Design a protein around this ligand. Structure first.
Ligand SMILES: Nc1ncnc2c1ncn2[C@@H]1O[C@H](COP(=O)(O)OP(=O)(O)NP(=O)(O)O)[C@@H](O)[C@H]1O
Ligand SMILES: Nc1ncnc2c1ncn2[C@@H]1O[C@H](COP(=O)(O)OP(=O)(O)NP(=O)(O)O)[C@@H](O)[C@H]1O
Ligand SMILES: [Mg+2]
Ligand SMILES: [Mg+2]
Lengths: 224, 224
């Protein structure tokens, strides 16, 4: 088999995809599992003046494995508008719809040279890419496994379970992981009691990302 | 037929259920459609010291139609903890699980005396009530129509469409309405372009609450 592919989505923008992706790739690389970070679609950027977008952060990490990589090797559709990608594309690049067949080829080409290809999405599972496809559709076309990152605040129960319902209704292997930030102990008192109950009753438990680097590495790499 | 019943849920706590419920009930009552507001389950309250919970606000509105109403007539399970109702119940009232058969009877009794019974939920569609039921399950047992209120910020696309997927996967009549707050014009530039596209492609469009009091009154009251 060629390298494994793990898509990283989230309950919400700013839940922690980039933070968690970078931590997981660092952990895998430290275990000798050669791992690249890709951000194929990114909104909210201005590359002429700012070098700290997600693709820039990924690029810094990635060049520890390949100095020759450049931004355009790991991120392909980039927009200024802080919006769903479909809208940003229609406004800023009307003649170039996002081509997910092209993306699928470019992402799978990295499975030749990496043990694990981590793909950060944008927006959320239902956020529109093209007129006919959302982020989940893209992940399904990739045949990737899915890591959905949740925020750690009140509301995470509802958000996790809305995504669980959508994911379980589709043919893909997925995990949900809560990105539990430092200084948050309300989580343990308010939300954790239900996560624990849910996990006794579910075949696919919701985990805490920070407790789960080994589990998530195992998940990403298992099988064919 | 006896009075109609409309359940009000949301994308997130604080999206605007109470605000929108009170506006819709006021509009219906001003049209001669006798409407009561109920908050059967409420967390985060301390009735010994605070009289501005959702049930208190509903009670003030409701007593314009019936002076004899009291808090216990319109709200039945009330907890101090700011959490999902299941957790608050297990911690504060371990011997009294929330009984949704009891709730269904109490809520339906108001269809004798009102043209429309508006029922605010808590937490979100997937938030747990009992070990076996969430808010959506409660609304399904009620046989109510559903009004899901969305927030108006970046992220509303994903949130609305996650709820749309869950709702359309169940046997109930529902609308999604965005609670568009004053002073928000980013909405029109950032999110509205996709809502408009989605609505051309959907048999059940996402509306803006503030544009939709007549439409939503019609929805709540139509048919048997
Ligand atoms: N565990 C954490 N501890 C402390 N800060 C965090 C943590 N996770 C995320 N952050 C901060 O929260 C912000 C958002 O996190 P980030 O990982 O960029 O989210 P994201 O989901 O990738 N955002 P986006 O790609 O724009 O949708 C950043 O400033 C992070 O540094
Ligand atoms: N359209 C609006 N314009 C201005 N303020 C609003 C608007 N909608 C909601 N708010 C305020 O936002 C806060 C939350 O609204 P509220 O209607 O109480 O939400 P909710 O969904 O019922 N909350 P909860 O029942 O606790 O889950 C309140 O302080 C409201 O006054
Ligand atoms: Mg990111
Ligand atoms: Mg409320």
């Amino acid at each position: 088999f060629q390298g494994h592919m793990l898509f990283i989505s989230a309950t919400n923008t700013n839940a922690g995809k980039t933070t968690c992706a970078r931590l997981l790739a660092q952990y895998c690389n430290a275990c000798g599992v050669k791992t690249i970070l890709l951000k194929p679609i990114e909104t909210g950027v201005n590359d002429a003046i700012n070098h700290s977008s997600d693709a820039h952060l990924f690029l810094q990490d990635n060049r520890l494995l390949d100095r020759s990589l450049t931004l355009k090797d790991i991120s392909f559709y980039r927009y200024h508008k802080v919006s769903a990608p479909l809208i940003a594309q229609q406004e800023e690049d009307p003649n170039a719809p996002i081509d997910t067949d092209n993306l699928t080829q470019r992402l799978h080409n990295f499975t030749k040279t990496y043990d694990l290809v981590i793909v950060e999405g944008a927006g959320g599972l239902c956020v529109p890419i093209t007129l006919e496809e959302n982020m989940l559709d893209f992940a399904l076309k990739l045949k990737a496994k899915m890591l959905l990152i949740s925020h750690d605040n009140l509301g995470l129960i509802n958000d996790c379970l809305l995504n669980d319902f959508l994911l379980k209704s589709h043919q893909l292997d997925y995990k949900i992981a809560i990105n539990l930030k430092g200084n948050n102990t309300a989580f343990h008192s308010i939300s954790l009691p239900y996560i624990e109950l849910f996990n006794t009753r579910s075949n696919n438990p919701i985990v805490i990302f920070q407790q789960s680097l080994k589990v998530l590495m195992s998940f990403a790499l298992k099988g064919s």
